[PDB]
């Protein structure tokens with residue numbers, strides 16, 4: 001950062017902005033397999049001025065997103081994933097960089113000073129985050145698409161550290177697309193997989209039953225395994241404990257509730273960033289093991305075992321003692 | 322990979338530093354002082370939980386330093402303590418709907434190729450129309466511009482002799498900081514600032530004129546100055562300004578252009594180049610591009626000098 005870094009931190013949102021335009025405009029797609037593209041032909045396809053697009057490239061080359069040739073311009077080694085529409089980088093841009101996040105960020109300091117029931121997001125949109133998602137078809141599919149990435153990364157080691165082979169019926173609460181169950185079903189075949197979530201239009205996948213309901217109401221029983229993945233961190237204590245009450249109220253002993261979340265550690269850039277995001281969007285938070293035990297104890301739950309899948313991701317086995 | 326996702330999410334770093342400054346917490350961190358988060362929260366009526374979480378994030382990104390005392394600004398981020406710092410003024414000026422909403426529109430402005438800038442597509446009125454309407458933004462704009470002028474003065478006076486001039490006009494001079502600073506070191510001259518005012522500014526030994534440089538420019542000045550004006554305008558409009566400059570000038574009169582020159586040894590120019598496209602449908606220019614618009618406006622580039630790494634001086638005559 002060359003001696004003085006504070007200014008580079010402040011202006012570096014411009015780097016995000018430039019990458020976002022490159023993606024949003026729909027130009028990132030033409031840079032597949034490290035191909036060198038002629039900007040004029042590219043500019044001529046989408047009806048953009050050559051000069052403006054050539055200049056945007058010059059900035060993307062400087063920051064190291066693009067690379068320069070005698071004929072054309074290509075994506076760099078480290079930024080190849082911008083060409084792939086099913087990469088964590090492309091989907092992060094698609095979901096995160098928009099009015100829903102950026103205008104809520106500009107409201108965040110006002111929400112800190114105005115201590116009330118309203119989150120920074122609700123102060124802007126006048127609705128809940130998920131209420132707004134269900135009204136906007138495009139963002140929900142972008143939300144689910146990016147969430148699908150974070151399930152696929154734990155799926156490999158989740159099946160290793162836990163025995164789903166020993167569970168007759170399995171219910172995923174706030175599962176969206178059953179990406180957790182879909183990927184589990186592929187490995188652990190011949191079991192009852194159920195997904196409960198708010199669907200305006202219901203999704204379907206072979207061997208997955210998509211229940212349509214609200215987890216603030218009593219949750220259907222008959223399931224040996226209940227699972228909450230990245231759900232509790234969307235809610236404060238009053239709302240989160242109320243969800244666990246409905247899990248505890250639905251679990252006959254001999255049954256387990258699975259909770260997978262970004263467990264806050266003393267020193268994690270990823271979790272801390274997401275934690276401020278939760279506060280901004282839902283007036284919620286990421287939690288420590290002791291915070292989970294406390295909210296678990298409130299409804300009336302105990303942890304048989306806790307262990308980490310990744311550095312950031314951790315698993316908590318919960319039962320109605 | 323690690324690099325690409327860090328570039329994408331690093332807006333959160335900007336966003337966090339903005340919340341810190343905007344909320345008014347920044348002022349209590351002067352002279353490397355360590356603040357008790359609890360009393361800081363209690364003072365501002367902020368929930369301790371929410372603040373200490375925000376603070377933790379600033380400690381991870383490196384803005385703050387944790388201790389037994391409490392928390393302080395890091396040596397490299399000290400400038401958030403100073404409310405007339407280039408860093409602090411950049412936050413106040415640049416991190417707001419005006420810029421961020423215009424950035425979100427920027428891809429639309431590319432595809433929907435028309436005269437309307439990303440900013441015009443959001444606000445329905447030009448950047449300067451919007452700035453003249455809002456006293457808060459203009460004061461912030463002028464405050465941050467004043468900082469960028471103050472850096473130039475020292476070596477601007479060394480390479481160009483204002484002492485040999487007596488009637489000097491600053492075109493789009495705003496608050497007239499350029500003439501205010503030069504007037505202090507160079508006395509007994511007629512210093513005039515031409516801009517769009519509502520209540521014309523006041524300063525000793527500085528004349529402030531209400532004017533439009535798209536209309537014929539006042540004659541009888543021997544030095545005209547355009548500093549960070551032409552990068553707000555596309556070629557046709559930039560030519561109209563330089564054309565009004567030529568027609569105002571005679572021989573034995575000189576025009577000074579102080580812009581961020583599009584020279585690869587400049588770090589910040591290409592980022593500001595995209596900022597100008599987004600805000601004005603304008604750009605920073607290569608020397609060859611200035612040569613182009615100067616010739617069309619009937620001007621000649623006499624000399625070209627490097628003020629410093631980013632800033633450049635162009636001397637123009639009529640011919």
Ligand SMILES: Nc1ncnc2c1ncn2[C@@H]1O[C@H](CSCC[C@H](N)C(=O)O)[C@@H](O)[C@H]1O
Nearest residue numbers: 130147174175176197198214215229230231
């Ligand atoms: N009242 C409610 N009842 C049930 N599900 C709800 C709900 N409010 C929000 N949700 C759902 O809670 C989910 C939180 S995001 C987590 C998605 C999924 N568990 C995963 O890990 O990939 C969203 O899919 C949202 O639709």
Ligand SMILES: Nc1ncnc2c1ncn2[C@@H]1O[C@H](CSCC[C@H](N)C(=O)O)[C@@H](O)[C@H]1O
Nearest residue numbers: 466493494495516517532533534548549550
């Ligand atoms: N038509 C017009 N006539 C005169 N001044 C104009 C103008 N349109 C814009 N301006 C002014 O041109 C200036 C451009 S910004 C440059 C400010 C100053 N020269 C500096 O270096 O900091 C603004 O102050 C703006 O108000």
Ligand SMILES: O=C1c2cccc(O)c2C(=O)c2c(O)cc(O)cc21
Nearest residue numbers: 150230262270273274277278281312
């Ligand atoms: O940004 C993230 C994120 C980033 C990296 C890794 C991640 O796991 C996440 C994640 O899980 C997550 C989330 O669950 C809900 C959000 O609103 C945002 C994020």
Ligand SMILES: O=C1c2cccc(O)c2C(=O)c2c(O)cc(O)cc21
Nearest residue numbers: 415466469549581589593596600631
């Ligand atoms: O952002 C900048 C800027 C940044 C760094 C260094 C700079 O010099 C500038 C600058 O001059 C400038 C400007 O003249 C007009 C603007 O709207 C924005 C900027």
Ligand SMILES: [Cl-]
Nearest residue numbers: 230231232233
């Ligand atoms: Cl959660």
Ligand SMILES: [Cl-]
Nearest residue numbers: 129143277281
């Ligand atoms: Cl989210």
Ligand SMILES: [Cl-]
Nearest residue numbers: 342345347348
């Ligand atoms: Cl402040």
Ligand SMILES: [Cl-]
Nearest residue numbers: 359360361363
């Ligand atoms: Cl206190």
Ligand SMILES: [Cl-]
Nearest residue numbers: 453517518519
């Ligand atoms: Cl006006």
Ligand SMILES: [Cl-]
Nearest residue numbers: 550551552580
């Ligand atoms: Cl300029």
Ligand SMILES: [Cl-]
Nearest residue numbers: 608609610612
């Ligand atoms: Cl030339």
Ligand code: NA
Nearest residue numbers: 449450453517
């Ligand atoms: Na105006």
